Swiss-Prot record, chains A, B:
Phosphorylation at Ser-193 by NEK1 promotes the closed conformational state preventing excessive mitochondrial membrane permeability and subsequent apoptotic cell death after injury. Phosphorylation by the AKT-GSK3B axis stabilizes the protein probably by preventing ubiquitin-mediated proteasomal degradation. It holds the Pfam family Porin_3. The chain crosses the membrane at residues 26-33, 39-48, 54-64, 69-76, 80-88, 95-104, 110-119, 123-132, 136-145, 149-158, 165-175, 178-185, 189-198, 202-210, 217-226, 231-238, 242-251, 255-263, 273-283. Non-selective voltage-gated ion channel that mediates the transport of anions and cations through the mitochondrion outer membrane and plasma membrane. The channel at the outer mitochondrial membrane allows diffusion of small hydrophilic molecules; in the plasma membrane it is involved in cell volume regulation and apoptosis. It adopts an open conformation at low or zero membrane potential and a closed conformation at potentials above 30-40 mV. The open state has a weak anion selectivity whereas the closed state is cation-selective. Catalyzes the scrambling of phospholipids across the outer mitochondrial membrane; the mechanism is unrelated to channel activity and is capable of translocating both anionic and zwitterionic phospholipids. The modification Phosphothreonine is found at T19, T107. It comes from Mus musculus. Homodimer and homotrimer; in response to cyclic AMP or calcium; oligomerization is required for scramblase activity. Component of the mitochondrial permeability transition pore complex (mPTPC), at least composed of SPG7, VDAC1 and PPIF. Interacts with SPG7, NIPSNAP2 and SLC25A30. Interacts with hexokinases including HK1. The HK1-VDAC1 complex interacts with ATF2. Interacts with BCL2L1. Interacts with BAK1. Interacts with RTL10/BOP (via BH3 domain). Interacts with amyloid-beta and APP; induces VDAC1 dephosphorylation. Interacts with TMEM41B. Interacts with BCAP31. This is Non-selective voltage-gated ion channel VDAC1. ATP binds at E12, K20. The modification Phosphotyrosine is found at Y67. The gene is Vdac1. The modification N6-acetyllysine is found at K20, K109, K252, K266. The lineage of its organism: Eukaryota, Metazoa, Chordata, Craniata, Vertebrata. There is a cross-link at E12, K20, K53, K109, K110, K161, K266, K274 (Glycyl lysine isopeptide (Lys-Gly) (interchain with G-Cter in ubiquitin)). GO terms for molecular function: ATP binding; ceramide binding; cholesterol binding; identical protein binding; oxysterol binding; phosphatidylcholine binding; porin activity; protein kinase binding. The modification Phosphoserine is found at S13, S193, S240.
């Protein structure tokens, strides 16, 4: 409806067409459960094919939807630990508060974060305070919506240098079938994307990017074809001659396999082409 | 050395040749981590190919080896929850105490268990008290060792019927290369097995079983060939004409795939042959 996305979510759909259905040079094992009320868990195994380094993630999550509450514990294989409490729609509809705690016993270094979001018709506001060692930093964002139009600002203030270190503007238009998104970062990096839901089975995206000091231009084109409900193909090219190819199949209910190939241009089937395999398991 | 196994462990090796390297009619996803001191986790996803029912297990484990302590939390997709505290070698070398707690919110039904084991040269004693609803039951076991010989007794007393409900004897001989194991259950079921470590690459087993009231006989033969350190083949037959075939490959370090086939005899490649796929991920 008329409640705009967060700054970060501006351009998500186009990004989603380019990123999801590919995991080049990785073998991924995902185990998730679904409990809309109560206890949930996500375990993830990742193996880099070029390095053979193997990562492991567990996330434990209690949703208490009566109280708009979510508690999340996370663990990785570097022994880094994470707590996240989230209150949503409690003191007021569209308000969201998150207290987030981090601790790597590997380094002894902590990290706490308080994130606030307020959201209503035409406006999406955020303020994120990172209480870092060499912090805090505060990241604030405002998105305003006008009849499918979206204008955004995002800034980051590092108290150590007592200065703004990031200043991003975004402008866009957004129906369900079509999204224009444009952004400039630090008055220097230019981005734009078009996402089109061409029909129920085909998503396409175009991506543009360039720098204020530099006459060259980066672009990609991307497509996602949902052949049937249990299979989909994804392909992308960029003007650096890279080709991405992606196939996701549901083998059995709750079991999805993804095969990925990233090919280099001209030297196609003549050298260093990354492959990927993802297996997702839903219970 | 001269410290014998537990009653349950009598015949493990032979059982291991018959069971490991096969998972017929199942798709399994295992994610484990290794931390000999501290935090460990095992997540398991199982899909029955014939039913398409999908099971999910998480196990969380802190080992505190300074104190011989292990805490384990477990969860399954039926919402059943489990705690296990374990003290080993603390008040005395070879003593092991376990307090184990269960609770299915699905049924509201609890289950607590206290298990004690004492172990030393020539003897392996256990007493397990299941504090069940329609319990308790106490299961006690004694294994005695004499120069490779092993004699065992195992009983179960249900306090509700105030009677012994199980009474098992086992006799065996056991070097590292070779195990004879024989057992009679409730004076009626007869079991025996031979395990031979024929060399560093080949394990074989033979299995026999029959009933005091019944002139028929069940047997299986089983082999496990370790071709190289990253591949192994397993095959078994039984006198009911079933054939098991198993291949386990290490694809990348920490990633192991198992393909299983269970074939019916005479009707081989002419009907209902179960297949299996296991993927194990170590991080």
């Amino acid at each position: 409806m008329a409640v705009p996305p967060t700054y970060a979510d501006l351009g998500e759909s186009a990004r989603d067409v380019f990123t999801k259905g590919y995991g080049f040079g990785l073998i991924k094992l995902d185990l998730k459960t679904k409990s809309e009320n109560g206890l949930e868990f996500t375990s993830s195994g990742s193996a880099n094919t070029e390095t053979t380094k193997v990562n492991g993630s567990l996330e434990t999550k209690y949703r208490w939807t009566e109280y708009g509450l979510t508690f999340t514990e996370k663990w990785n294989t570097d022994n880094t630990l994470g707590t996240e409490i989230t209150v949503e729609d409690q003191l007021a509809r569209g308000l969201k508060l998150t207290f987030d705690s981090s601790f790597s016993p590997n380094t002894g270094k902590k990290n706490a974060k308080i994130k606030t979001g307020y959201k209503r018709e035409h406006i999406n506001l955020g303020c994120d305070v990172d209480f870092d060692i060499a912090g805090p930093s505060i990241r604030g964002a405002l998105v305003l919506g006008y009849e499918g139009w979206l204008a955004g600002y995002q800034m980051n203030f590092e108290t150590s240098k007592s200065r703004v270190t990031q200043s991003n503007f975004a402008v866009g238009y957004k129906t369900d079938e079509f999204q224009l998104h444009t952004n400039v970062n630090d008055g220097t990096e230019f981005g734009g994307s078009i996402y089109q839901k061409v029909n129920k089975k085909l998503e396409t995206a175009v991506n543009l990017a360039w720098t204020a000091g530099n006459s060259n231009t980066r672009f990609g084109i991307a497509a996602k074809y949902q052949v049937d409900p249990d299979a989909c193909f994804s392909a992308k090219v960029n003007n650096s001659s890279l080709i991405g190819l992606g196939y996701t199949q549901t083998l059995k209910p709750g079991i999805k396999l993804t095969l990925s190939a990233l090919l280099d241009g001209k030297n196609v089937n003549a050298g260093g082409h990354k492959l990927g395999l993802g297996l997702e398991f839903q219970a």
